[PDB]
Design a protein around this motif. Structure first.
Motif, mmCIF file in Angstrom:
data_model
loop_
_atom_site.group_PDB
_atom_site.id
_atom_site.type_symbol
_atom_site.label_atom_id
_atom_site.label_comp_id
_atom_site.label_asym_id
_atom_site.label_seq_id
_atom_site.Cartn_x
_atom_site.Cartn_y
_atom_site.Cartn_z
ATOM 1 N N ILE A 1 -0.970 38.070 -40.843
ATOM 2 C CA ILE A 1 -1.548 36.735 -40.887
ATOM 3 C C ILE A 1 -0.499 35.769 -41.422
ATOM 4 C CG2 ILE A 1 -3.947 37.475 -41.084
ATOM 5 C CD1 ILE A 1 -3.800 37.257 -44.014
ATOM 6 N N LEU A 2 -0.683 34.492 -41.102
ATOM 7 C CA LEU A 2 0.315 33.466 -41.361
ATOM 8 C C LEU A 2 -0.144 32.503 -42.449
ATOM 9 C CD1 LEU A 2 1.221 32.574 -37.665
ATOM 10 C CD2 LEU A 2 2.573 33.980 -39.220
ATOM 11 N N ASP A 3 0.835 31.922 -43.142
ATOM 12 C CA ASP A 3 0.609 30.869 -44.123
ATOM 13 C C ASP A 3 1.669 29.793 -43.920
ATOM 14 O OD1 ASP A 3 -0.592 29.467 -46.136
ATOM 15 O OD2 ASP A 3 -0.419 31.038 -47.657
ATOM 16 N N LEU A 4 1.568 28.716 -44.693
ATOM 17 C CA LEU A 4 2.465 27.576 -44.574
ATOM 18 C C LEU A 4 3.592 27.674 -45.591
ATOM 19 C CD1 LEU A 4 2.850 24.828 -43.070
ATOM 20 C CD2 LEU A 4 1.797 23.771 -45.080
ATOM 21 N N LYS A 5 4.807 27.365 -45.146
ATOM 22 C CA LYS A 5 5.990 27.366 -45.995
ATOM 23 C C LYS A 5 6.293 25.949 -46.466
ATOM 24 C CE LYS A 5 9.405 29.654 -47.721
ATOM 25 N NZ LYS A 5 10.711 28.941 -47.697
ATOM 26 N N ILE A 6 6.595 25.813 -47.755
ATOM 27 C CA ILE A 6 6.867 24.521 -48.374
ATOM 28 C C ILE A 6 8.309 24.515 -48.860
ATOM 29 C CG2 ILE A 6 6.340 23.001 -50.306
ATOM 30 C CD1 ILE A 6 3.484 23.581 -49.999
ATOM 31 N N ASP A 7 9.086 23.542 -48.388
ATOM 32 C CA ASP A 7 10.496 23.430 -48.738
ATOM 33 C C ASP A 7 10.819 21.996 -49.136
ATOM 34 O OD1 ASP A 7 13.156 23.917 -49.152
ATOM 35 O OD2 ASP A 7 13.649 24.329 -47.057
ATOM 36 N N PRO A 8 11.228 21.759 -50.386
ATOM 37 C CA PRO A 8 11.632 20.399 -50.777
ATOM 38 C C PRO A 8 12.833 19.877 -50.008
ATOM 39 C CG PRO A 8 11.233 21.796 -52.697
ATOM 40 C CD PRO A 8 11.296 22.701 -51.513
ATOM 41 N N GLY A 9 13.736 20.759 -49.574
ATOM 42 C CA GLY A 9 14.899 20.321 -48.826
ATOM 43 C C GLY A 9 14.595 19.886 -47.409
ATOM 44 N N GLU A 10 13.468 20.326 -46.855
ATOM 45 C CA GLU A 10 13.103 19.945 -45.498
ATOM 46 C C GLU A 10 12.661 18.489 -45.450
ATOM 47 O OE1 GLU A 10 11.209 22.769 -42.820
ATOM 48 O OE2 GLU A 10 9.529 21.371 -42.610
ATOM 49 N N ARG A 11 13.131 17.774 -44.431
ATOM 50 C CA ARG A 11 12.743 16.390 -44.200
ATOM 51 C C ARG A 11 12.443 16.209 -42.718
ATOM 52 N NH1 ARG A 11 16.711 12.958 -42.298
ATOM 53 N NH2 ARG A 11 15.683 11.167 -43.284
ATOM 54 N N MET A 12 11.253 15.690 -42.414
ATOM 55 C CA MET A 12 10.762 15.669 -41.043
ATOM 56 C C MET A 12 9.887 14.444 -40.818
ATOM 57 S SD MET A 12 11.740 18.263 -39.037
ATOM 58 C CE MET A 12 12.352 19.943 -39.105
ATOM 59 N N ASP A 13 9.733 14.092 -39.547
ATOM 60 C CA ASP A 13 8.832 13.019 -39.149
ATOM 61 C C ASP A 13 7.380 13.472 -39.320
ATOM 62 O OD1 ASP A 13 7.298 11.068 -37.540
ATOM 63 O OD2 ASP A 13 9.219 10.486 -36.678
ATOM 64 N N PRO A 14 6.503 12.611 -39.846
ATOM 65 C CA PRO A 14 5.080 12.983 -39.959
ATOM 66 C C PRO A 14 4.409 13.289 -38.628
ATOM 67 C CG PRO A 14 5.570 11.149 -41.399
ATOM 68 C CD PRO A 14 6.819 11.394 -40.614
#
Lengths: 95, 50, 50
Positions: free
Chosen positions: B3-16
Protein backbone atom coordinates in the motif's frame (compact mmCIF):
# COMPACT_ATOMS: atom_id res chain seq x y z
CA UNK A 1 2.65 -14.73 -31.79
CA UNK A 2 0.00 -14.13 -29.13
CA UNK A 3 -3.31 -12.75 -30.49
CA UNK A 4 -3.47 -10.05 -27.79
CA UNK A 5 -0.42 -8.22 -29.18
CA UNK A 6 -1.73 -7.80 -32.74
CA UNK A 7 -2.44 -4.13 -33.48
CA UNK A 8 -4.61 -3.15 -36.45
CA UNK A 9 -4.93 0.58 -35.65
CA UNK A 10 -2.26 3.13 -34.68
CA UNK A 11 -4.13 4.16 -31.51
CA UNK A 12 -2.16 1.86 -29.19
CA UNK A 13 1.26 2.55 -30.75
CA UNK A 14 3.57 4.79 -28.74
CA UNK A 15 7.17 5.48 -27.82
CA UNK A 16 9.28 3.23 -25.60
CA UNK A 17 10.22 5.03 -22.38
CA UNK A 18 12.16 2.47 -20.32
CA UNK A 19 12.30 -1.23 -19.43
CA UNK A 20 12.04 -3.27 -16.25
CA UNK A 21 12.38 -6.90 -15.18
CA UNK A 22 11.92 -9.28 -12.27
CA UNK A 23 15.26 -9.49 -10.41
CA UNK A 24 15.76 -5.72 -10.68
CA UNK A 25 12.37 -5.06 -9.09
CA UNK A 26 12.94 -7.65 -6.35
CA UNK A 27 16.26 -6.07 -5.35
CA UNK A 28 14.65 -2.63 -5.63
CA UNK A 29 11.81 -3.60 -3.29
CA UNK A 30 14.25 -4.99 -0.71
CA UNK A 31 16.35 -1.81 -0.87
CA UNK A 32 13.27 0.40 -0.49
CA UNK A 33 12.11 -1.55 2.58
CA UNK A 34 15.51 -1.47 4.30
CA UNK A 35 16.28 2.20 3.54
CA UNK A 36 13.07 3.43 5.19
CA UNK A 37 13.64 1.70 8.53
CA UNK A 38 17.31 2.72 8.55
CA UNK A 39 16.39 6.37 7.91
CA UNK A 40 13.63 6.35 10.54
CA UNK A 41 15.93 4.90 13.19
CA UNK A 42 18.59 7.45 12.22
CA UNK A 43 16.26 10.45 12.58
CA UNK A 44 14.99 9.64 16.10
CA UNK A 45 16.61 8.16 19.19
CA UNK A 46 15.91 4.45 19.60
CA UNK A 47 16.57 1.82 22.27
CA UNK A 48 16.89 -1.58 20.59
CA UNK A 49 19.33 -4.38 19.86
CA UNK A 50 21.67 -3.58 16.99
CA UNK A 51 20.82 -5.13 13.61
CA UNK A 52 22.56 -4.31 10.32
CA UNK A 53 19.83 -4.12 7.68
CA UNK A 54 21.78 -5.21 4.60
CA UNK A 55 20.45 -6.43 1.24
CA UNK A 56 21.59 -9.81 -0.15
CA UNK A 57 21.98 -11.04 -3.73
CA UNK A 58 18.75 -12.87 -4.57
CA UNK A 59 20.06 -14.40 -7.80
CA UNK A 60 22.93 -16.22 -6.08
CA UNK A 61 20.52 -17.63 -3.49
CA UNK A 62 18.24 -18.89 -6.27
CA UNK A 63 21.22 -20.47 -8.04
CA UNK A 64 22.32 -22.17 -4.81
CA UNK A 65 18.82 -23.56 -4.23
CA UNK A 66 18.77 -24.81 -7.83
CA UNK A 67 22.12 -26.54 -7.36
CA UNK A 68 20.90 -28.10 -4.10
CA UNK A 69 18.46 -30.26 -6.09
CA UNK A 70 21.32 -32.25 -7.67
CA UNK A 71 22.64 -33.76 -4.43
CA UNK A 72 22.28 -37.45 -3.56
CA UNK A 73 21.33 -38.84 -0.15
CA UNK A 74 22.58 -42.32 -1.05
CA UNK A 75 25.72 -44.08 -2.25
CA UNK A 76 26.46 -47.07 -4.49
CA UNK A 77 29.00 -49.62 -3.25
CA UNK A 78 30.08 -53.17 -4.03
CA UNK A 79 30.50 -54.55 -0.49
CA UNK A 80 28.95 -53.54 2.82
CA UNK A 81 30.97 -52.26 5.75
CA UNK A 82 32.33 -54.59 8.42
CA UNK A 83 30.01 -54.91 11.42
CA UNK A 84 31.75 -57.60 13.51
CA UNK A 85 35.44 -58.18 14.21
CA UNK A 86 37.26 -60.60 16.49
CA UNK A 87 39.99 -60.39 19.14
CA UNK A 88 42.36 -63.35 19.49
CA UNK A 89 43.53 -64.17 23.02
CA UNK A 90 46.01 -66.85 24.07
CA UNK A 91 43.24 -69.46 23.76
CA UNK A 92 42.80 -71.66 20.70
CA UNK A 93 39.04 -72.33 20.86
CA UNK A 94 37.57 -69.07 22.23
CA UNK A 95 37.59 -65.50 20.89
CA UNK B 1 0.25 -6.72 0.02
CA UNK B 2 1.74 -3.29 -0.82
CA UNK B 3 0.00 0.00 0.00
CA UNK B 4 1.07 3.57 -0.71
CA UNK B 5 1.47 6.75 1.34
CA UNK B 6 2.53 10.34 0.61
CA UNK B 7 6.15 11.50 0.77
CA UNK B 8 6.93 14.94 2.23
CA UNK B 9 10.14 16.71 1.22
CA UNK B 10 11.02 20.29 2.25
CA UNK B 11 13.51 20.50 -0.62
CA UNK B 12 10.83 19.75 -3.22
CA UNK B 13 9.28 22.78 -4.92
CA UNK B 14 6.40 22.37 -7.35
CA UNK B 15 3.44 24.11 -8.95
CA UNK B 16 0.16 23.66 -7.00
CA UNK B 17 -1.50 22.61 -10.26
CA UNK B 18 0.49 19.35 -10.07
CA UNK B 19 -1.09 18.49 -6.72
CA UNK B 20 -4.58 19.48 -7.86
CA UNK B 21 -4.29 17.35 -11.02
CA UNK B 22 -2.93 14.40 -9.02
CA UNK B 23 -6.07 14.73 -6.91
CA UNK B 24 -8.13 13.83 -9.99
CA UNK B 25 -5.69 11.16 -11.20
CA UNK B 26 -5.59 9.27 -7.90
CA UNK B 27 -9.32 8.54 -7.87
CA UNK B 28 -9.08 7.00 -11.35
CA UNK B 29 -5.87 5.06 -10.68
CA UNK B 30 -6.47 3.37 -7.30
CA UNK B 31 -8.86 1.16 -5.34
CA UNK B 32 -9.81 2.17 -1.80
CA UNK B 33 -12.40 -0.24 -0.46
CA UNK B 34 -14.75 -3.16 -0.83
CA UNK B 35 -12.53 -6.24 -0.99
CA UNK B 36 -9.00 -4.77 -0.97
CA UNK B 37 -7.16 -1.45 -1.14
CA UNK B 38 -4.00 0.05 -2.62
CA UNK B 39 -3.89 3.08 -0.30
CA UNK B 40 -3.67 3.97 3.36
CA UNK B 41 -6.46 5.99 4.94
CA UNK B 42 -4.25 9.08 5.26
CA UNK B 43 -3.34 8.86 1.57
CA UNK B 44 -7.03 8.71 0.63
CA UNK B 45 -7.69 11.71 2.88
CA UNK B 46 -4.95 13.72 1.16
CA UNK B 47 -6.27 12.77 -2.29
CA UNK B 48 -9.77 13.87 -1.25
CA UNK B 49 -8.42 17.23 -0.07
CA UNK B 50 -6.52 17.67 -3.35
CA UNK C 1 14.10 11.35 66.85
CA UNK C 2 13.21 10.47 63.25
CA UNK C 3 10.40 8.00 62.59
CA UNK C 4 11.95 6.70 59.36
CA UNK C 5 13.83 3.39 59.46
CA UNK C 6 17.30 4.08 58.07
CA UNK C 7 19.54 1.48 59.77
CA UNK C 8 18.21 -1.85 61.01
CA UNK C 9 19.94 -5.02 62.19
CA UNK C 10 18.53 -8.03 60.34
CA UNK C 11 19.24 -11.74 60.08
CA UNK C 12 20.63 -13.29 56.91
CA UNK C 13 17.32 -15.02 56.22
CA UNK C 14 15.60 -11.62 56.40
CA UNK C 15 17.74 -9.95 53.69
CA UNK C 16 15.47 -10.78 50.74
CA UNK C 17 12.32 -9.51 52.50
CA UNK C 18 12.52 -6.11 50.77
CA UNK C 19 11.26 -7.62 47.49
CA UNK C 20 7.73 -6.21 47.39
CA UNK C 21 7.56 -3.88 44.35
CA UNK C 22 5.97 -4.53 40.96
CA UNK C 23 8.37 -3.77 38.08
CA UNK C 24 7.52 -3.81 34.37
CA UNK C 25 10.28 -4.35 31.80
CA UNK C 26 10.02 -4.22 28.01
CA UNK C 27 11.42 -7.05 25.90
CA UNK C 28 14.84 -6.62 24.33
CA UNK C 29 13.53 -7.61 20.90
CA UNK C 30 11.13 -4.65 20.91
CA UNK C 31 12.15 -1.03 20.41
CA UNK C 32 11.38 2.18 22.31
CA UNK C 33 11.55 5.36 20.24
CA UNK C 34 10.79 9.00 21.13
CA UNK C 35 8.80 10.71 18.38
CA UNK C 36 8.15 14.12 19.99
CA UNK C 37 10.00 15.98 17.22
CA UNK C 38 7.79 14.28 14.62
CA UNK C 39 4.93 16.65 15.50
CA UNK C 40 6.61 19.51 13.59
CA UNK C 41 7.26 17.64 10.31
CA UNK C 42 5.10 19.29 7.67
CA UNK C 43 5.07 21.33 4.48
CA UNK C 44 3.19 24.50 3.59
CA UNK C 45 0.95 24.58 0.52
CA UNK C 46 1.43 27.59 -1.74
CA UNK C 47 -1.57 29.33 -3.28
CA UNK C 48 -1.85 29.66 -7.08
CA UNK C 49 -0.34 32.92 -8.32
CA UNK C 50 -1.26 35.38 -11.12
Amino acid sequence: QRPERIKTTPYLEGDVLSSDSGPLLSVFALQEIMQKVRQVQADYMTATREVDFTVPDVQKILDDIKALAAEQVYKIVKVPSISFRHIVMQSRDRV
Amino acid sequence: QIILDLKIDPGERMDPAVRMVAGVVGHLLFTAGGRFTNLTQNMARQLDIA
Amino acid sequence: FINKRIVERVRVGQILAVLNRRFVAYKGKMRIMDITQSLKMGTKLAAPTV
